[model samples]
Target: DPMVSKGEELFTGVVPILVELDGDVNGHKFSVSGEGEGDATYGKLTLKFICTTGKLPVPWPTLVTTFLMCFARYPDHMKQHDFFKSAMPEGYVQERTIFFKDDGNYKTRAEVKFEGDTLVNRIELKGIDFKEDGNILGHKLEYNYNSHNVYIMADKQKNGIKVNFKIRHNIEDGSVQLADHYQQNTPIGDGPVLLPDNHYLSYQSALSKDPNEKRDHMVLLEFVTAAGIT
Candidate 1:
């Protein structure tokens, strides 16, 4: 029989996360200050991703549409996992709020559970009403992801555009490293790509059609303890 440890305390306290997005479309960086109230085994984090740079990225309509087209041709891109939601145990929740200046804000609530040594996260977008260029673009939109093998899907009901990206994560050196698809030689899908093993998990987007578009849209997340900061 396999021995399983229940509710082991790994980390606790206020965690500051840095979110960086780099790509050809709209490259920007931001910071998220979060508080971790529980231990690593069973705990919760309340995070806020704010755009303190004072400059906003491209409109949501353009950004979401570009992401949609990247995976529109693939039919088998969206994989259904009945175990996705079932894997998350009850009462363990993590919440993240993202503010994009005039583009409005997004509230994400993630339910987490541990499958042996692996951590499973199921994130659902709560209150999807985002504005872009004074127009409410995310009113009919929905986004969610499961971070076991990392599967993310965003749907726009008004335009009938649905996009999905598959990725994976590995926890090492006290940080979660997010990479491309778990499978080998997958097609050029939307979302983040793997980077070198640093303290941060960097997400690099795929290249654009324009050869001159050298900008890489990326989002990097780094967690640090309150005492670690000055």
Candidate 2:
């Protein structure tokens, strides 16, 4: 499995993850963090898909890989305290939020404004790179695109809202585009744990606790997007 190898390769890096603290209420949190330009770089990526869902069937391990590759450049370049130091700090936040919206889809007309923790962000997006997996599961992953939020913005504490963001760069068809807030090659998601219909998976359908209350519940998510280089 070429992807399996990529998974193993990523494990070798110095990944800085934060604690998804919620005691038993929320599951454990896992994310990537680093400092300096070396910290960011989406060299290569691979994704998975379910033919029936048309969208991602659910979060897959491969998805995280795609996420980290695309946005690591943010924290690395801007550093933690200098959140806005990156090209467009506003846009950077979107990219970071979506890739980690555990299961929420990256949406259009996106922003990270907080009406308190009650309103979290949920992202959803369409794609152009859907490869075929000729396997029994018939699961083929998405490539070169992803969405999510920053694991933890530098000095800023975690907002009560738990977000699930999604990212993608597949604009070949009627798909979405990256936000102008911060013009980059990627797109992002933000917000707390809000479940709006099929897009947001509920507690019963979701894997986290108190799926409704953004802060009361834990935001357990992973981001995975990628871009290729010659």
Encode model 1's per-residue lDDT on 101-202: one tens digit a residue: 344444444434443433433344432334433222322221211222122222122111111333322222333222222111111222222211111111
How do the predictions measure up, each by TM-score?
A: 0.26, 0.24
Lowest summed lDDT across 10 adjacent residues in model 1 is found at: 65-74
Candidate 1 to native Cα RMSD, angstroms: 19.2
Task: State model 2's lDDT.
Answer: 0.25
TM-score (C-alpha, index-matched) for candidate 2: 0.24
Candidate 1 stretches with Cα past 4 Å from truth are 1-91, 96-99, 134-221, 228-230
lDDT of 2 by residue, 107-190 (tens): 222232222311122222332222222210122322333444323212223321123333333333445433212211222224
Local distance difference test values of all predictions, in order: 0.25, 0.25
